[PDB]
């Protein structure tokens, strides 16, 4: 695999963007207990499908959704085109089990979002599930979905053809797509060959994607070393190199990095979970991702009435108030020469090092960097000079006051370009 | 309270009818985890209310619902006008939290059902909750609804006025109403005066109901001695005199009796519960209720797409095929002079005793009844004669074959009217 | 022959008849799981490490254990035999085995072979001793491959199934050599491998070699196997767990009733091993009726007690047993020495029979007449079993109708009916 | 009111010097092996639970082996449960037959045996004693726990208080010198308005009795609030002073000697399902972090029903001791340092010496926010090599040749003036 020039350009734009919004939306939103409900509660596949003919998110408005997300500073959206329950949220001809043909809503919401994304300057990424709890040609089964009541059995080859045909539709009828974001491969990690490219038909899938849209980036949330043909690496609920959530532990690759996370605790809408992370924690999460050279893909789970959660919209609005001031210290940067520490992180652009102080009550900060003369240091907002001392061992900044919250940012200007590790 | 003559007339018709269908339907059908979900999961009243603007039961059809129910032999429907979550399934003007104003469906389903009920000859009963998990004027709180996020406090007097105004709408704008079926007063059984008529404004409520529709029957699912003004007594998930479900134990009154039960395990739609009682068990439940002089109110929980569960429609249809043969042995009867036994039950009408053999391998049956000469005994369906021996100790019936299922019915004719 | 190839010896057939005559035995589930007092399955249920669990043995000291007192309290109930766990699923041996040091003599400070002590007192007091033995083992690494249980007990090495089978053969040999005459071996656990296509075969479980070995050592020893399916050739009794034969209220049965002697087993509270949270012991009335219903279905009742970690039988269980024996002092002849009666069980009760005698056990009837579907044998007399008062009856070609002067009393209103001809079996 | 004796004040300073002790929770709840709260948590009938006693025989118990394994860690004292909430006495009390000597086949006074060995091996013995009782019917009225243990008779609170006084007298008369009484359980009555008063719990009389029999005996009471007059140590449960990650703290830091208690696995009593013992690295750093906050660490082990200390805990203690063999002077005999805890580590101090404990740092330099006291020298504590430093009015910057090693990279700084205690 050798990525095309347009793909490489897209990789650079992706890393420049730093911030996107995940959207998990499907008929599981009506049950309002998370996107895994079909499997978690062993719901019969035919009984679950009866929900579709009552699905009517009357307050859905794509312009409003995209506007609310753009106001956060985010530059792209990743939306579930089809999740594990096998329901398609677009006008597919591969199955009548889709938002157009099976619901009274009768509208291709992916189409409506694509149109508004294009109009508002937001890039559209498509989540697509390798795992299927409904179709009988997902056979043999893996570790999940054994309780969903399937009693017939089809051919894996036909399931793979189904996925190819759906990917082809998604990359034909919805304009330029910035990425395909695969998920679910891990379902067969119980078999010896269950995590191979051959088992999952990855080479054919990736070649097909890049043939239709060479600039489209491919990610696959398998939590292991990226397969040839992937263009981004995904870390689920952890910064690269961290494993507090237990879904990581894999080596950091050379691909563009993206951490995904929930704003409350769940990907799909969950009516019992209204505990949304504070704006301060969300801002620091984005800064910490940027400081580890990674994008943040922050999730919102839309309601069954088609509105984004009001509290999520407020958080996004307030993140955008901060981005109004600080976006140039995050967007367009890469992880800085000083890797993340307990006090905070650094990001860099050209000859500029942004020092993001997130957690420090003292009035001095040692930076382990030498060999590049520091010409100036100022507070990013006020532009006041920051006193400093530099020698062959590093740089010591001194501050007039306690670092303020949520991020006390210093702009350091060096004589030479900062190295890219 | 002395019931009007129209009310007494309605009480006898109710008992004649013997069989009705309960319907629990609301926006809780969307969450498909039972009608109690708002309390069970301590759902915030404002967050729960956001569900209404996505409620669109597009496959609802009142004519199909009523026809599927009529086909079972059932004679009446009891539907939730407003349950504990406080959402009104009708075009109330007392709150904007209703099916017409708060949902994109925009249709008064109770008015559509009332119209089909009247056209198809089915009587309409209305369930109404005394308990409210949403309104801040339901104050002080009882034992439920403490977790639904209310932070303002109103006045019980205004909540009582709310209930009166809704009852007036229901008994004025929907034609003749066969019964008001109250529920939820047990929520305040934790307080010393929590279960009094004064606390719950029952006398003013009951008088209002009977003023607007004197023939309307009043039931109250309080699980205790019926209050003056009530016209039916409710046993929840048990036959009168039994307490296998733990919600009964109260003395049997002289009011008409009604047992309510679920066809699967839950009143509201519940996607995890697809375990519907067999047709045999449902038929036997109706017969056992009749044999204890009680109606059976059997429940269906409609889906959020507006359809009755297809398996429930099937069960109803199959009950109706049985009723097409056997309806005269339970409708128009009262509990029989021989009270329920392990082998089955009896029902009666005039001088006729119907013996319902539900569970018997023997080719004979002893009946402990004496003092009334038995003139004839036949198989109800075949009309063939059944040999019998009668003396002062009782009656012994003898059969040619072992009793068939689900109900082997004998028709016995006595010289004198059977006592009640 | 009920079971081809296998022909039971004359002495085995005699033991089968005595077993059915006895009708009533007491199950005893005792082991170091009694210390944890949360049931005999605790090592699997809580995924306890096999090495950590074994550390319990060096603290096991049931100082109030008294074999004579146990056997006396059990004899007092009318029970005729005891079935005791020699080794349950946790793999701990409650006797002086040379196949493993993980046993009550070598691994505990108690240092006493309690099966030997019980066998001696059973012989002294006229009670027969049956031995439970587990096919399933959650400790040994030669229980390999695993079945559906025991995957969480921390085994990290693997042995050979052939060595596990040799281990069981040599333990069975010890049990049938060193403890006198043994009335039955009661196997359990082979359902563990019902997840495999050949997992329930005689070949997988080495049953033919085991059964042949048992009957070679003690031809009169009866073999039962709690597999919940059709009995394998060489078994001499059929077990129904927590149900009467033909019933399946507890969900562990459903298998056809064989021609072997039948035995239903049940707990007196809800659990087999001692369980400190479960003090809900069935009433004497329910226990008496359970024994009668078993006898009426031609089955023995094996009723369980789970001894405490201090070595005592639960006081409430001893009281129930005493009160059952008070009833048996009067009514034992209507159950012991009988077989299931020509009238099979009904909602009102059951019948048992012996010779020309039919005992009608009315367990649940408020009316003052009872129809009995039996004809072809002249009824000569009917009396109340205890008072001996005559019971009025009418007999014709369709059956018998008894009439009673009073509502039937509890827990069992027994009538004794005497016929002209032997009752059929 | 309360003025501590000269001997009490001396014992307070020795306790703080010692820094490190081992908690032992042992009782017949060890046989059920599901925690010391089991009789309440599972609503066990008090009579049925007591039947366990006649099967209790910890045949592998050996007081010398226990004390030896604890001494090998560097710890200087042991705190053992003389009687926990289940009401069972682990010593030869004459106030109840429900005790290890009279009610079990073991027939041995394990507190006596431990006291003998503690004296022989030079380890101080502290006695935990529960104010809460789930068995006795004179614990009446009930508080929030123990309502399911099946009591159907009612005694008198004054008789329960007399029972406690009589047991405390035994423990302070028949067992040699006792370094502390460690009370627990009065929070049971925090549901009543007067439920946390000294009057309700008879504390003044109890404390006066303890200090009359053994004036140097230190009194602690795990009530999670401001210490009562007469207490000589303050207890923080599962948190360092000033922290509340475990939710049992939040009380102001007093001027009494401070002690944080914690479990090695997750439970105080033996728990057969819980074999997740904190790593030696985490245990050493816990001890250092406690010392850096001017607190002792009381680290728990829950002995098995066969009488052995868990072997993994013995091994952890041994490894702790291998670290203490090198680093004990940087912890024992110190007080919390003038630089309070930071993300990178902590400081401790003695005289003019500041020990800088680097616990979590990838840099080859460290800024210390301390001024007004001239730094005379800085060395690596273990190697003794000099550490370069810069000092000015804003603080001190230390520079290191290599990345700090684990579990604790210790620098020894020597100042011109005595370090203050704030
Ligand atoms: Na009868
Ligand atoms: Zn378009
Ligand atoms: Zn012997
Ligand atoms: Zn001594």
UniProtKB/TrEMBL annotation, chain B:
* Gene Ontology MF: a single term: metal ion binding
Record-annotated Glycoside hydrolase family 29 N-terminal domain positions: 1-326
Which is a GO BP term held by this UniProt record?
A: fucose metabolic process
Q: Which UniProt keywords apply?
A: Glycosidase, Hydrolase, Metal-binding, Signal, Zinc
Q: Which residues bind Zn(2+)?
A: 111, 115
Enzyme Commission designation: 3.2.1.51
- Indicate the annotated site residue(s) for May be important for catalysis: 260
Q: What is this protein called?
A: alpha-L-fucosidase
Organism encoding this protein: Tannerella forsythia (strain ATCC 43037 / JCM 10827 / CCUG 21028 A / KCTC 5666 / FDC 338)
Per the similarity annotation, which family is this? Belongs to the glycosyl hydrolase 29 family.
Q: Which domain of life is it from?
A: Bacteria
Q: Which SMART domains match?
A: Alpha_L_fucos (SM00812)
A cellular-component GO term for this protein: lysosome
Q: Name one Pfam family in it.
A: Alpha_L_fucos
State its role.
Answer: Alpha-L-fucosidase is responsible for hydrolyzing the alpha-1,6-linked fucose joined to the reducing-end N-acetylglucosamine of the carbohydrate moieties of glycoproteins.
Q: Does the keyword Ligase apply?
A: no
UniProtKB/TrEMBL annotation, chain C:
The species is Tannerella forsythia (strain ATCC 43037 / JCM 10827 / CCUG 21028 A / KCTC 5666 / FDC 338)
> What positions does the domain Glycoside hydrolase family 29 N-terminal occupy?
1-331
A GO cellular component annotation here is: lysosome
| SMART domains linked | Alpha_L_fucos
| Single GO MF annotation | alpha-L-fucosidase activity
Give the UniProt family note: Belongs to the glycosyl hydrolase 29 family.
Q: What is the lineage of its organism?
A: Bacteria, Pseudomonadati, Bacteroidota, Bacteroidia, Bacteroidales
Q: Cite the position(s) of the site with description May be important for catalysis.
A: 265
Full protein name: alpha-L-fucosidase
